[PDB]
Amino acid sequence: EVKIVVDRDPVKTSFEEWARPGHFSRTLAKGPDTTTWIWNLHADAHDFDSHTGDLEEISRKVFSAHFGQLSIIFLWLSGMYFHGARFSNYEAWLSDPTHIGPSAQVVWPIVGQEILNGDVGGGFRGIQITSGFFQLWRASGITSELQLYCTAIGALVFAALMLFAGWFHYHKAAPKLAWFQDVESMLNHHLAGLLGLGSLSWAGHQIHVSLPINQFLDAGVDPKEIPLPHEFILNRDLLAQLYPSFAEGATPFFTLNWSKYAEFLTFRGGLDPVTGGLWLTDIAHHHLAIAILFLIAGHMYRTNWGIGHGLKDILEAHKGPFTGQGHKGLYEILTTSWHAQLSLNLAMLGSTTIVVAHHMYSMPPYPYLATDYGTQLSLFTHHMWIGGFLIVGAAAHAAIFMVRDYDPTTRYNDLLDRVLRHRDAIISHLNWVCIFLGFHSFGLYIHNDTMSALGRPQDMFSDTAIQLQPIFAQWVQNIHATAPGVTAPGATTSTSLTWGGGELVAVGGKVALLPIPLGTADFLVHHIHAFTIHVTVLILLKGVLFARSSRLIPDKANLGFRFPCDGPGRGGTCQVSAWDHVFLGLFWMYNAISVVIFHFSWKMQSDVWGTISDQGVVTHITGGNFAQSSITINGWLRDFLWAQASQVIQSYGSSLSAYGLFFLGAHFVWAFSLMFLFSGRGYWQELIESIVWAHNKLKVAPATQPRALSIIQGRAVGVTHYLLGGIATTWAFFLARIIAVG
Amino acid sequence: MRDIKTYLSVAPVLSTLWFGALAGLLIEINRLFPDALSFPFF
Amino acid sequence: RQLWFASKQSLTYLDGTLPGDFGFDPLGLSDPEGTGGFIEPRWLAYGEIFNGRTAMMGVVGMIAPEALGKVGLVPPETAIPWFQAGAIPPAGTYQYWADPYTLFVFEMALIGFAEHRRLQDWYNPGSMGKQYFLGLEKYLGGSGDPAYPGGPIFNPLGFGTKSEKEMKELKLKEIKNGRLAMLAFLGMSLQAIFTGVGPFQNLLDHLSDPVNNNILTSLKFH
Amino acid sequence: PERPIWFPGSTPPPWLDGSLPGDFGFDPWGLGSDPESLRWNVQAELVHCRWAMLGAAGIFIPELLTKIGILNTPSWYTAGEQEYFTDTTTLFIVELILIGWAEGRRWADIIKPGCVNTDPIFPNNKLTGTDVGYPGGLWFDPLGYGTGSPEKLKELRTKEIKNGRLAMLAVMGAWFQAEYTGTGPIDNLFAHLADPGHATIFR
Ligand code: CLA
Ligand SMILES: CC(/C=C/C=C(C)/C=C/[C@@]12O[C@]1(C)C[C@@H](O)CC2(C)C)=C\C=C\C=C(C)\C=C\C=C(C)\C=C\[C@@]12O[C@]1(C)C[C@@H](O)CC2(C)C
Ligand SMILES: CC1=C[C@H](O)CC(C)(C)[C@H]1/C=C/C(C)=C/C=C/C(C)=C/C=C/C=C(C)/C=C/C=C(C)/C=C/C1=C(C)C[C@H](O)CC1(C)C
Ligand SMILES: CC1=C(C/C=C(\C)CCC[C@H](C)CCC[C@H](C)CCCC(C)C)C(=O)c2ccccc2C1=O
Ligand code: SF4
């Protein structure tokens, strides 16, 4: 059945191994042969799979390790709440959120660096933040420095709880294997307990605290006089003075007269004109609706009583003619291998983060988030990068599974077999498309640029010339605009304001949203994204399929997951290891994402954001030039890189100086990485030797013999810096630009 | 007790302790003799 | 051996030798296959009897002071429903010889001596009658059963004088009473949230008017 | 072995065996797990036992006697700020030298027992103590009182540590009380005597 059998004191808490570096691995433990040793110490620190050969210990280590990862997050949260309480103009920000920048960092004045303390207003100074906590603390009705302090302590305590918990469950009472593999109950609790009861509890706090309090601040009152949140929960008559449905108590909920709670549980849609965010009634309803759906879904898989499904039997009924044995056997290979689960989870959590970034800019959920141009740009950019990386990780661990855990004599699967057998078709067809999109997406930009350069602006691809109208997006925009009429009679308005119809929402002389048009200039760039996404898929997919064998090397599996090459024979076999396919994917992931966050930044400044006249005419930040200048490659140079880098470049001598330095500093690191990617090891090894000789002359030759980095480390350092230089350069480019213009 | 001291003697832990002390010292001197473009004693 | 809502798992280990047994256990807890901490069938039994005993004096104090305020010679000042005695300030309080939070720490220290020593005898039988404790060591060794230490300080006259059946009969009475009190205290609470007029009053509300039946009403007030 | 333990019924650590005066088997973190650190730490606890004993005498006795009207001593808390016959700095400097002399020689005895006990000037002034940390001699035992049988010194030394531990808590008592209460230690005693159940940390 399903029970809790654990062990007692597997590994004794002691400090011995803390003074025996490289104890975990048998190879590393003998000592530092050369400096190659101190690099292999960290490269194999967390690879629990290579230390031991059984699933039980690997499990207990990953289970306890997560507790550490969970603990750090709490400590990270604790600082953010603490800092917002002791070093912020939050309470001032609650008075005029429209035109006082959120600041929650203050620097010590040592070497003149107090120039960084910007005049964010509100009688305060400091680094203007952009993570947008302030809109999060207002949407939860905090309205006090004291309440930000107590949660900071509460957040800190849990960190000690988690960190303690990690210790307890690896040294004192560690679970057994049978505990881990019972994945029906695993899903059963997470769906009902974590996901389900998480929302319902939160839908609680919104009903009794965030809603009635924020309804005071939105109504307009000084924060200091809002009765404390435990007054409503005690004095039930106060909730009556706003929400008369709270007189009858919770009995309508029990008599199915649910249309009595219509005051604070609605289906409005749209955005709030006062605060530019969603209607907290909808949000209040939303988590409640989600709560029920998850909770019921929790009760599906059989755990201990008669009722419930069997995850094994579900996978063993779907087998088709084209597919053969179908999903039989996938239960094992998804249960006796952590690298399978980590690869599968990474892709979904990777994808979801992206969808988060597409929704949070079009349905602004927190109050006074819409007119916070510094926040919108950062939050959209941040989760794109997070979403991009995690997807690449799903390729690496899927590739690792093919090399280490896959075995067609015991863990045999049929679908994963058929997929292997026709892999030549899969890559070649994906190869042709990546070429097709390559010619018809970039080429149109090149042809546009050539014709424009020759004085033929009537042969370019644009709205004023040969036209390419996205109709399919223009059609679906139409449908969502008229959905409130027929196909969703409950809704008062559309689910957003970017649908091809409606009206803008103005908050304090700053546009929240308005219908986003889709002309030709948008059609091209959407087919750029379809191109770089496909190419990135090609590299990672090729790595996963060919991680065990190919027509070049027939025994690549025997060489492991990350090996440099197989020598210069057969024409040259540099970079055939699956690790080097993900190594290549990173650049395209860095390429796909970068154009997306360029596309978002220009489209919103040119077509959406911007001030609004008192009369009613709207003037966007860049004057609406995206629809004409974004179709020529030179256009992306003049009017985006050259014209929107002005603020970062001349940011010297004012609080935005720290961005001016990072802008340069990130170039230096980017250009630095090239030394590792372009060159090779055998040159650096020899130059090291001559340097080593001079130290022999003066007797200062070390005993950990100097060595050059290993082949796959020269690449690993090469890509890491390149990514760090590329991402940070955009970081300093964006924040300094948007903070100055809005 | 011996094992704790040995661990505290491994290279990375000394580095942060050593450099941290060095950072504190330089910051203090710049707090007391700031701008310091020349050495005007002799 | 009367069984209530038994289960195949339950009757593999609930042998009935433990007093208060009725073979009711559908959540895998007392299962002896899985024993880390706090899932030992002894410890759970140890926590079962203690919680009951705390309930057996917790319940009576949860209805004594107001009901004794119904006729008794208690001056009405210290005759109050239990939740307004001072435990829950938002329900009310009363000014005792102290001011609160000094009563707490005093209480937590006095409890600390009895509690921790009460814990050690579970870890190390007979230990608490070895180190000097101002005399009294002759008793604090216990009889070897942590839940039933015995001794002239704990079992002064001595019942269960000599009869295991009686003791088994007695301990059966001790748990079923314990279960009765735990549920009862859970009654005095959930009544308070909904009724909000005090425990013993809420029995009169159903006495003078059985048609009250606050279930159907479900009005909430402090 | 069967000596009283801080936590009765617990198993004391092996390196604590009751030999040393004041060994109630208390070392949860094992700071004295290895013999050498124990040896040094024994000294550390010993001297800390003597300083606070004077400090407890230094704080409580004058504040007591000034609370009643017999004298004029101010608060120990602001005792440093007061201006005496010269600047504080030089007196501290003078304190640096002279203490460094004893804290120098004491240091030599610690690292090398028995090599410091003879007077550098008048060599017939040799000190009599044999145990590290117990100098003996006519300066520090004007009548002996340390040269006795065991089970008496062990009693006496335990009467020296057990008081010292009582001091170190008390002076840190006078420390934190002066910070979050506004008055001297004796007031914190009396205001706790008028309403013991009300006037505490919880104001
Ligand atoms: C600016 C630099 C650059 C360019 C142009 C390319 C171009 C290409 N790379 Mg690539 N790559 C680069 C940098 C670049 N890479 C870097 C730095 C890396 C390291 C990370 C990689 C890593 C990499 C990998 C790993 C892969 C590619 C792939 C591809 C090809 C897919 C795109 C395609 O088919 O479009 C078609 C070609 C173009 C759009 C180029 C412009 C052509 C224009 C439209 C017209 C050209 C003139 C015309 C022919 C007239 C001829 C004139 C006559 C006189 C001759 C393409 C050839 C993928 C591939 O080949 O598989 C599909 C692939 O798997 N590259
Ligand atoms: C409390 C203290 C040290 C306490 C140490 C503790 C608890 C450690 C406990 C543990 O390690 C063990 C035991 C075992 C581990 O396994 C467990 C833990 C728990 C980790 C030192 C105080 C030590 C206190 C001292 C030394 C006090 C000295 C007083 C002095 C010097 C005099 C000061 C004055 O001169 C001024 C300043 C001003 C004048 O006006 C007034 C006077 C008073 C005259
Ligand atoms: C068995 C099983 C098995 C399966 O498998 C599953 C399931 C079924 C789930 C399970 C079940 C379980 C259960 C039911 C349990 C319960 C318990 C309880 C209730 C306890 C209480 C318990 C309770 C208790 C102790 C209580 C106590 C109390 C007290 C002291 C009181 C006190 C007081 C008073 C007087 C007055 C003042 O002024 C206040 C106060 C202070 C407040
Ligand atoms: C530059 C370069 C090197 C040389 C880089 C080396 C040898 C490592 C860089 C030196 C590091 C920083 C060691 C210095 C840190 C030591 C621990 C000493 C610390 C002392 C400091 C506190 C001063 C390679 O080894 C290499 C290998 C493969 C492909 C490309 C390259 C490559 O491009
Ligand atoms: S160049 Fe390097 S990677 Fe390529 S074959 Fe030679 S050794 Fe291998």
Side-chain angles (χ1 to χ4, degrees), chain A residues 1-7 9-37 39-87 89-185 187-244 246-340 342-550 552-742, chain B residues 1-34 36-42, chain C residues 1-8 10-13 15-26 28 31-38 40-49 52-55 58-61 63-65 67 69 71-77 79-98 100-102 104-112 114 116-161 163-165 168-181 183-187 189-194 196-201 203-206 208 210-219 221-222, chain D residues 1-52 54-83 85-102 104-142 144-161 163-165 167 169-197 199-203:
Chain A
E1 303 83 30
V2 179
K3 66 195 69 174
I4 65 172
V5 191
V6 303
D7 290 357
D9 309 330
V11 175
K12 185 178 57 173
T13 294
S14 171
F15 270 83
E16 306 155 84
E17 317 288 354
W18 284 38
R20 294 187 64 262
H23 66 84
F24 48 89
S25 184
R26 286 279 81 98
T27 303
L28 306 166
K30 296 171 190 179
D33 52 1
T34 63
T35 61
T36 291
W37 184 92
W39 303 118
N40 314 145
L41 174 60
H42 304 67
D44 299 328
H46 284 159
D47 182 10
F48 306 157
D49 192 4
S50 63
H51 308 168
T52 54
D54 53 2
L55 194 61
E56 184 171 342
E57 287 82 327
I58 299 179
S59 312
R60 294 158 176 184
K61 300 186 198 174
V62 311
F63 181 49
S64 301
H66 299 164
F67 277 113
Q69 175 55 78
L70 203 53
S71 164
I72 295 191
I73 303 182
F74 272 109
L75 182 50
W76 170 63
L77 283 194
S78 185
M80 306 324 291
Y81 283 14
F82 181 93
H83 271 289
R86 199 88 174 188
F87 307 104
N89 58 342
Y90 179 66
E91 286 204 329
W93 175 88
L94 271 173
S95 54
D96 285 343
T98 50
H99 51 76
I100 299 177
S103 164
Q105 181 182 1
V106 178
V107 299
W108 284 311
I110 305 105
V111 296
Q113 69 170 13
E114 60 265 38
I115 206 179
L116 303 202
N117 287 346
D119 183 6
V120 307
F124 190 51
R125 305 179 57 81
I127 302 302
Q128 173 163 348
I129 80 177
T130 190
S131 47
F133 270 109
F134 280 13
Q135 294 81 0
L136 173 63
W137 291 332
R138 179 188 167 94
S140 176
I142 286 303
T143 179
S144 291
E145 278 164 3
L146 173 59
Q147 307 175 38
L148 292 174
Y149 194 109
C150 64
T151 63
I153 298 303
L156 183 57
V157 177
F158 274 84
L161 266 299
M162 287 314 115
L163 174 59
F164 168 84
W167 172 80
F168 190 76
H169 273 304
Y170 184 48
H171 300 103
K172 198 68 60 58
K176 290 182 69 183
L177 178 57
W179 194 82
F180 279 116
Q181 285 174 348
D182 187 63
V183 295
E184 293 92 358
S185 162
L187 283 163
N188 202 310
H189 288 87
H190 290 186
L191 291 187
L194 170 61
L195 271 307
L197 293 178
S199 54
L200 170 60
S201 70
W202 177 247
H205 167 270
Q206 306 209 225
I207 293 281
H208 303 268
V209 174
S210 85
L211 175 48
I213 289 180
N214 199 357
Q215 187 266 9
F216 278 159
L217 298 171
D218 284 6
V221 183
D222 47 350
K224 295 305 171 59
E225 206 48 46
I226 297 317
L228 290 193
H230 53 79
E231 297 296 332
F232 306 121
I233 201 177
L234 271 188
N235 186 341
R236 201 175 88 179
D237 301 336
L238 254 63
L239 286 183
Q241 293 312 134
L242 310 174
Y243 294 153
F246 277 150
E248 292 98 351
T251 178
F253 177 90
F254 277 96
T255 62
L256 294 153
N257 294 347
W258 292 11
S259 162
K260 181 56 79 57
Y261 307 137
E263 286 150 12
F264 60 89
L265 299 180
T266 81
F267 202 94
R268 187 173 322 279
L271 317 178
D272 196 329
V274 157
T275 198
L278 285 171
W279 289 90
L280 283 85
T281 42
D282 305 327
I283 294 185
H285 194 171
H286 160 70
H287 297 82
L288 183 48
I290 279 294
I292 312 306
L293 166 63
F294 269 138
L295 202 154
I296 294 155
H299 290 117
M300 187 191 304
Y301 310 93
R302 180 259 309 263
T303 56
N304 274 326
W305 298 262
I307 67 190
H309 272 144
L311 266 169
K312 182 174 193 298
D313 299 312
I314 311 289
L315 289 181
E316 287 192 7
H318 307 59
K319 61 180 181 309
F322 292 147
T323 49
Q325 288 298 287
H327 316 80
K328 173 172 197 163
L330 268 162
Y331 186 40
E332 291 65 18
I333 83 165
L334 263 184
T335 296
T336 77
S337 67
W338 285 89
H339 293 293
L342 173 54
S343 69
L344 179 49
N345 288 0
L346 274 176
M348 314 304 299
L349 178 59
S351 284
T352 289
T353 304
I354 304 175
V355 183
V356 172
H358 270 267
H359 293 180
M360 279 195 309
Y361 93 97
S362 185
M363 292 155 297
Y366 308 103
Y368 293 112
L369 188 83
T371 69
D372 198 303
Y373 296 151
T375 308
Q376 283 289 263
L377 182 59
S378 41
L379 283 184
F380 177 98
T381 300
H382 168 73
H383 299 107
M384 211 67 56
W385 283 114
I386 303 283
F389 273 88
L390 294 167
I391 292 186
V392 158
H397 284 282
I400 299 191
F401 160 69
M402 290 305 309
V403 177
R404 292 188 170 176
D405 303 0
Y406 167 82
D407 176 293
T409 44
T410 73
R411 318 252 65 91
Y412 179 91
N413 182 13
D414 204 12
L415 289 186
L416 184 55
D417 179 291
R418 309 167 87 80
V419 175
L420 283 198
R421 292 195 310 191
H422 68 287
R423 53 189 185 171
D424 289 315
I426 299 184
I427 300 306
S428 71
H429 294 93
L430 184 49
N431 177 245
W432 164 73
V433 170
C434 284
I435 290 190
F436 174 98
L437 280 188
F439 276 102
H440 291 65
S441 277
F442 188 59
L444 302 181
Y445 281 99
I446 292 311
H447 155 106
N448 273 19
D449 195 296
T450 300
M451 286 309 110
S452 193
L454 276 153
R456 292 144 55 124
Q458 67 281 35
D459 295 342
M460 286 165 61
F461 291 120
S462 87
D463 295 326
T464 62
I466 299 187
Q467 268 169 355
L468 295 179
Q469 291 289 36
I471 55 188
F472 285 3
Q474 276 180 336
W475 170 48
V476 161
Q477 277 218 334
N478 192 8
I479 298 303
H480 299 157
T482 68
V486 179
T487 40
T492 303
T493 56
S494 314
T495 182
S496 162
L497 268 305
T498 52
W499 305 133
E503 195 274 301
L504 56 86
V505 165
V507 171
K510 272 183 167 306
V511 160
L513 280 184
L514 58 92
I516 298 187
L518 290 182
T520 306
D522 302 356
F523 166 100
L524 280 78
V525 73
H526 280 82
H527 284 74
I528 283 299
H529 306 331
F531 164 50
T532 59
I533 282 177
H534 266 91
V535 166
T536 302
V537 172
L538 162 62
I539 306 173
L540 304 183
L541 187 50
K542 173 177 177 287
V544 185
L545 295 181
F546 291 124
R548 287 185 76 76
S549 71
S550 81
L552 196 58
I553 318 182
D555 54 18
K556 201 194 300 187
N558 197 10
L559 300 184
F561 167 65
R562 52 123 136 37
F563 60 101
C565 83
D566 197 25
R570 32 180 106 85
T573 73
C574 315
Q575 293 179 322
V576 288
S577 40
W579 187 96
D580 297 304
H581 288 133
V582 44
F583 158 80
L584 282 177
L586 261 310
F587 295 110
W588 282 89
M589 197 286 312
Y590 168 82
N591 193 45
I593 291 297
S594 64
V595 190
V596 177
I597 63 175
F598 282 168
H599 173 201
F600 173 75
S601 159
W602 197 359
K603 178 63 155 184
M604 288 299 266
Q605 285 169 17
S606 163
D607 284 350
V608 178
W609 292 336
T611 76
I612 170 65
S613 69
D614 49 358
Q615 265 304 287
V617 302
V618 55
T619 65
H620 298 281
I621 303 293
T622 56
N625 65 15
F626 179 94
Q628 284 309 310
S629 305
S630 67
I631 63 201
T632 65
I633 289 291
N634 176 264
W636 283 84
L637 206 69
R638 248 183 314 104
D639 308 344
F640 188 59
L641 291 205
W642 185 85
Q644 281 175 28
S646 283
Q647 276 74 37
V648 186
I649 285 305
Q650 62 200 29
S651 48
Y652 273 4
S654 48
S655 75
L656 303 170
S657 65
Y659 298 123
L661 290 177
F662 263 82
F663 185 67
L664 284 172
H667 298 117
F668 178 92
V669 176
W670 181 81
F672 190 89
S673 70
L674 304 189
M675 174 170 51
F676 294 95
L677 300 172
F678 288 179
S679 82
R681 162 178 201 271
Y683 166 81
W684 292 108
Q685 172 67 61
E686 280 181 347
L687 172 72
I688 280 294
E689 181 283 335
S690 307
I691 309 289
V692 160
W693 170 88
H695 297 60
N696 290 309
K697 199 81 176 168
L698 280 291
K699 307 171 176 181
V700 209
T704 46
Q705 304 190 349
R707 295 282 193 255
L709 280 62
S710 185
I711 298 302
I712 69 216
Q713 181 174 24
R715 305 167 184 170
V717 176
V719 54
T720 293
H721 286 77
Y722 190 105
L723 268 293
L724 181 54
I727 297 173
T729 307
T730 305
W731 180 87
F733 166 51
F734 277 176
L735 296 189
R737 155 69 177 179
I738 188 53
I739 288 184
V741 312
Chain B
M1 186 58 192
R2 198 177 339 281
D3 304 329
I4 300 175
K5 294 185 182 306
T6 306
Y7 166 76
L8 273 181
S9 182
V10 80
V13 193
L14 291 196
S15 305
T16 63
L17 300 181
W18 186 259
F19 285 113
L22 206 58
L25 182 51
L26 295 175
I27 296 168
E28 289 293 337
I29 306 176
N30 278 111
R31 197 192 60 183
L32 298 185
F33 305 100
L37 199 53
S38 53
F39 188 81
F41 278 1
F42 318 123
Chain C
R1 290 171 307 176
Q2 299 172 332
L3 303 179
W4 303 338
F5 277 176
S7 66
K8 175 177 186 174
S10 174
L11 298 183
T12 48
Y13 51 82
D15 195 77
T17 52
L18 204 66
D21 188 348
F22 290 87
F24 175 85
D25 184 8
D31 209 309
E33 190 177 344
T35 57
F38 302 158
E40 170 61 28
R42 313 178 56 259
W43 178 253
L44 302 170
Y46 196 38
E48 197 207 6
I49 315 174
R53 299 180 193 180
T54 47
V59 164
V60 181
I63 52 186
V71 159
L73 251 188
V74 52
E77 294 182 26
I80 295 295
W82 56 264
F83 45 81
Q84 300 165 247
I88 311 162
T93 178
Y94 182 94
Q95 290 204 357
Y96 301 88
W97 68 280
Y101 306 113
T102 324
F104 194 21
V105 56
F106 188 76
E107 184 184 319
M108 197 79 88
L110 277 302
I111 295 171
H116 282 91
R117 290 185 73 91
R118 187 263 321 254
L119 174 149
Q120 291 285 103
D121 179 84
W122 189 75
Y123 269 114
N124 294 326
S127 63
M128 296 291 96
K130 189 183 181 305
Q131 171 146 338
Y132 180 80
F133 199 88
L134 287 189
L136 311 180
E137 305 174 56
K138 44 181 298 192
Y139 306 108
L140 272 314
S143 47
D145 294 329
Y148 300 142
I153 183 52
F154 301 150
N155 183 23
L157 169 62
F159 271 77
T161 169
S163 190
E164 296 206 49
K165 174 62 182 175
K168 189 49 175 52
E169 276 165 321
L170 285 195
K171 297 166 188 195
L172 181 59
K173 296 187 186 176
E174 185 168 352
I175 295 186
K176 188 45 188 173
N177 279 39
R179 291 157 178 170
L180 198 155
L183 306 190
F185 178 73
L186 198 48
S189 178
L190 272 305
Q191 286 183 352
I193 308 290
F194 292 142
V197 310
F200 187 84
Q201 177 57 29
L203 177 140
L204 294 179
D205 295 291
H206 202 76
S208 35
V211 307
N212 191 313
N213 197 330
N214 171 45
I215 299 178
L216 193 151
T217 76
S218 93
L219 55 89
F221 275 122
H222 59 284
Chain D
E2 73 294 339
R3 69 184 188 282
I5 290 184
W6 63 296
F7 195 56
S10 53
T11 59
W15 59 85
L16 296 179
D17 61 350
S19 58
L20 306 174
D23 183 335
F24 304 104
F26 179 81
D27 190 3
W29 303 353
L31 286 179
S33 175
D34 62 325
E36 176 277 332
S37 300
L38 174 75
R39 180 176 308 105
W40 182 269
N41 292 134
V42 159
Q43 279 265 345
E45 189 179 2
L46 190 137
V47 58
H48 282 80
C49 278
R50 280 167 189 161
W51 282 126
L54 273 72
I59 285 173
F60 308 134
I61 295 298
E63 304 317 317
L64 184 152
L65 292 182
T66 308
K67 183 54 192 181
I68 72 183
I70 206 172
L71 274 177
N72 57 7
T73 68
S75 163
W76 73 269
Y77 174 62
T78 71
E81 193 274 351
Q82 318 303 329
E83 177 193 356
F85 71 84
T86 180
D87 52 299
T88 60
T89 57
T90 176
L91 296 159
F92 163 70
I93 294 166
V94 178
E95 182 184 330
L96 285 176
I97 303 309
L98 300 193
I99 300 305
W101 178 272
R105 297 188 62 100
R106 184 181 69 85
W107 195 344
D109 194 7
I110 291 187
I111 74 173
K112 190 154 170 282
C115 73
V116 200
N117 72 327
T118 86
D119 183 5
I121 310 285
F122 308 78
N124 287 343
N125 291 331
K126 297 160 304 318
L127 300 188
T128 59
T130 71
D131 279 356
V132 185
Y134 295 137
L138 192 59
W139 276 15
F140 315 99
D141 276 335
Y145 274 31
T147 70
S149 67
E151 305 175 3
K152 302 286 104 189
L153 314 179
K154 284 200 60 153
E155 190 191 3
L156 186 51
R157 273 68 194 277
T158 309
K159 291 184 164 305
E160 186 159 349
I161 290 177
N163 287 278
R165 288 159 177 175
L169 304 181
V171 289
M172 293 314 103
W175 189 256
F176 281 170
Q177 282 168 305
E179 294 179 342
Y180 290 162
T181 67
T183 58
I186 190 171
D187 190 3
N188 296 321
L189 168 61
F190 288 148
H192 174 84
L193 272 179
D195 49 324
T200 64
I201 309 259
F202 310 95
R203 72 266 179 200

